[PDB]
Symmetry: D2
Subunit: 345 residues, 4 copies
């Protein structure tokens, strides 16, 4: 049993706001001065029910957003051009919703809706954009497929628009669907790519070149993470790269290349090896075991194929002490390993 | 094996609350030497937690049951904090190596959730008991708020407060206050009803501060507001507003305005009845105007906080 | 030049709440052109110019009318900044897409409002004094605009000066008011009425906290109320009222007493000790000066039943009180 | 008047806990079964005041921590060995406090201290460690100097213990002094190093090699950030590297190398150039302006000074094709460069 709103005729006040919002939506002129609109909002929450004005605004927002779906059926459109079109649609939505939020600030801030479980105006916009644009199965699949394809291209050496990618993945975070839509597939595809890369390059390249490559990839993925992914992806991503390029090959690497690195006294590469293996569960342990093996095999070759035995031992001890000192950072475990291994001969 | 056994015995001692028959240094060393160890620790943790389920089939008085859950929760926490101290090296190297395995502490929570609180019988009995204590409190009984704080806090730590407890809690609150609103609106005059509604809002604020989670705040207060005021706005004004205004009851009018201000449509419905009152009373004088204007100005000023909307309504009404 | 002017005029329209006499597309384009060929500094400056100008109205004044004027100024500021943010969204986002240390447009606005309006010593003091006065009035029974208060305190939080400006003074004033209230009402009122009052105040302050204060104030506020109304009077309360509550079997009040004392350091402990004392004294008076109309056995059973019931309902079956009671009984049974 | 605590004699109950804590502190045996200690804590909060038991525990914690300062006067000790000593001390502290926290869990969780402003047992331990060990001017300066030196060494190509560095910087975060003690100096030092590196390498190396180097450094610093620094350092750090290696040299890079990159058709390098300049305020704008200049200049030569080999229509088509291709691959089809080029073409 409500009161009559002060206005010249029924619905005058709401109409002004309807027209203002449509102007915002079509990017034309707002043909009222702003004070009048702020007042309109204040009157409509004072004499009528706030929850109703919110429903009215939600509806005209929904009508417009629903209408923006159609531009995304124009396939088979170029993948990048599609992603740009989604981004432009996202920017226009955000711009419009921020402006609407300014006009209706009183509604957002109202004491009566303190306790309401109705989303804020901004969040209401996000629900609508999620529900009607990005949740559509065809649009989502094409958007996510395009994002993943850009990352794949970059990992293969191509130049892409990282800025476009940042903007899209950031949209996915604002819509709270980054984890669901994008992240699991991204980690799946990263797992598949680096599993295959690990196995392929471990045949094609010698250990020193492989380790240099693994280091580059870890630095690259850090840079991807900093530049356009969400921080919540960091542990998973690095763990995946570490696992596929190092974890799966720890023993193979050592078997193929450790003897050569140690025989040939390759200090820089030995340092790198130790840094990389330090990143993975079991790494230093597996290294330490093969180190014991190398050291034991050398003593057997001294006693069997000796010009002087003491001198040959001293030379080896010096070389190996030095490697422990610089490449393995003075790690006591390697010193002990070595002393135990020496007692074998 | 010798080394692992020491840690196995240590952990069992922690689990049975008996003596740790090694000096701590020796244990720290044992952990450092052994760095599978995580899986071994997980397993002996799981074995013990699984074994704690059986005490909850002995059903038993609701409060005694909740205390038994709380004790089990405290012992679990205590034990896991202590295990975590001994195995700190394992936690930190797992953290220094990027592992996707949960920390020791979190591993404990998954096990407690999975084996104790997730069980349908235990969960239903725990949540039923919590809800019963709140209901009893709302009825004027004294309960152990401390027990309640501790159990709800457990539900937050296990990350199941929203799922298990909160929806049922809001359901039960909705039911209780729906029925209270209808009952007391018949039994009590408006002044006494409004005083009561104010008490309930203050009480529920207190429950919230003292033992519930902040994420329950909006929902809870909105429910109390909706059921005690929102559903009765028009009936309250019809039953009591003419008397409050005729009799110049300023304190009650202030309270009315404060309460109605909290609820959708409240001030609006009040505003409309205000216009009605002024038109009717003003019509009876014209069929003295200064005395009425003074009375009315004073109510606007004190009870309605100088609200411009009521000043305008009144000026328009006087032009009748 | 030409292009910047359009944006300067638009922003001035927003600031004076008049009409924006360009269509929005043209403005969005103007912002995009100006970044595609200092603009942030220019926008900061025209924002600052306007906000600076809003100080003058606060040199005039009734406390509530002053606070309303501050609130209006805050709402307009927010409204204007949100709208400016819409037009210049491209600038915000390509600052965010470029790693910049410059605050967002929105945050830039908050720095300016803090610096020019609320940070002024006279305006801040008058604002804080008014806020404190409204809370004091409310605590004294007066009806105030909670909505105004919520809005102003929430402004203080957005400007990140709630802890500095308001909260310490608020806790000081609360401490003072409840210290004096505790001492005054402990003289004026019997224990049952005092406890009922303390409970009301705790419920009230919970409500103030929920309704308009920041959650960070919760622990401090409730501890202060607890300390001044209960902590400072635990012994005096028991001395003045515990014998009457127990003699007269006042179960509701005993329940409340236990609930309240449970909230405070030393509370249950001091209660427990006086409980032991009561039982020893009362028990001794049964065995020494028995009532003629009961048998000795009946009198002792009656007392045991009364006491068991109090433990059970008022003290929540607390084992410590059961033990204290059994021990105490052996002093006479 | 407080009640009498159930115990055989005054202070029996507290003594058990005092001995328990000392055992924890010296890493020896806890000579009571744990149940008895848990009970002791509960009794002391039930019959006596919680706040007092907390003060007592704080004091015996403080006494021990204060005593751990002296090992850090053994200078002039090797920087790494010092840092390892600080880390060991930090681990022991943490270990001891977690275990003390287990015994006194009831005290931490008590309802009466809900409203207390007293820090949790754990946080109490952090205040004490901060106040007595890491806050000491000599210890802090040596700790921070050593951390900064390890980073500097890493940037210069040496292998360091990143794990040690992660653990120490993480301690600094737990003690809430990462921003104060470390971060401002770290950004100062990073600013100084890369300002110098930018100026030095921009003389020593041609543009292609410089850009490749800058790219490496940005990838490296990302890796440092991920591996041992706090995330709150990310924006500042990258901005600094970007500013000193690219921002300060945008014009110089283009003036030294852009004509060559374009004349010689160096597509890979042009792609990298665009990616790097895209990271910096003004980057693409400055690149766009020089692009216009190149196209006007080269086009003006393609009409005033013809080649004998082709008609000049062919020479223009060859140039258009080259330039379209660069826009397409190096500049990612950027409309701004298409327009710039069309405008520039209308000049000749």
């Amino acid at each position: 049993s409500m009161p009559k709103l002060p206005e010249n005729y029924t619905d005058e006040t709401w109409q002004k706001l309807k027209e203002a919002v449509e102007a915002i939506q079509n990017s034309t002129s707002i043909k009222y001065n702003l004070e009048e609109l702020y007042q309109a909002v204040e009157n409509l929450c004072s004499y009528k029910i706030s929850a109703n004005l919110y429903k009215q605004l939600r509806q005209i927002c929904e009508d417009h957003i629903k209408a923006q779906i159609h531009q995304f059926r124009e396939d088979s459109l170029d993948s990048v051009l599609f992603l740009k079109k989604i981004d432009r649609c996202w920017q226009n939505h955000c711009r419009q919703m921020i402006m609407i939020r300014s006009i209706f600030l009183f509604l957002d801030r109202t004491y009566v809706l303190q306790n309401s479980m109705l989303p804020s105006i901004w969040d209401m916009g996000l629900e609508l954009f999620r529900a009607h644009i990005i949740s559509d199965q065809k649009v989502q699949n094409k958007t996510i497929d395009g994002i993943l394809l850009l990352i794949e291209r970059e990992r293969n050496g191509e130049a892409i628009d990282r800025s476009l990618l940042r903007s899209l993945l950031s949209m996915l975070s604002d819509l709270q669907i980054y984890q669901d839509s994008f992240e699991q597939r991204f980690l799946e595809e990263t797992n598949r790519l680096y599993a295959a890369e690990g196995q392929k390059l471990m045949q094609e390249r010698e250990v020193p070149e492989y380790l240099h490559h693994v280091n580059k990839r870890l630095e690259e993925e850090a840079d991807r993470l900093i530049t356009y992914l969400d921080q919540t992806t960091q542990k998973s991503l690095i763990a995946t790269v570490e696992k596929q390029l190092l974890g799966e090959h720890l023993t193979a690497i050592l078997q193929k290349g450790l003897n050569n690195l140690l025989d040939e006294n390759r200090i820089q590469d030995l340092s790198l090896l130790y840094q990389l293996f330090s990143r993975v569960r079991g790494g230093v342990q597996v290294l330490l075991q093969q180190w014991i093996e190398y050291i034991k095999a050398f003593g057997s070759t001294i006693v069997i194929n000796p010009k002087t035995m003491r001198q040959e031992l001293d030379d080896f001890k010096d070389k190996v002490d030095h490697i422990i000192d610089i490449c393995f950072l003075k790690n006591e475990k390697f010193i002990n390993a070595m002393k135990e291994a020496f007692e074998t001969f």
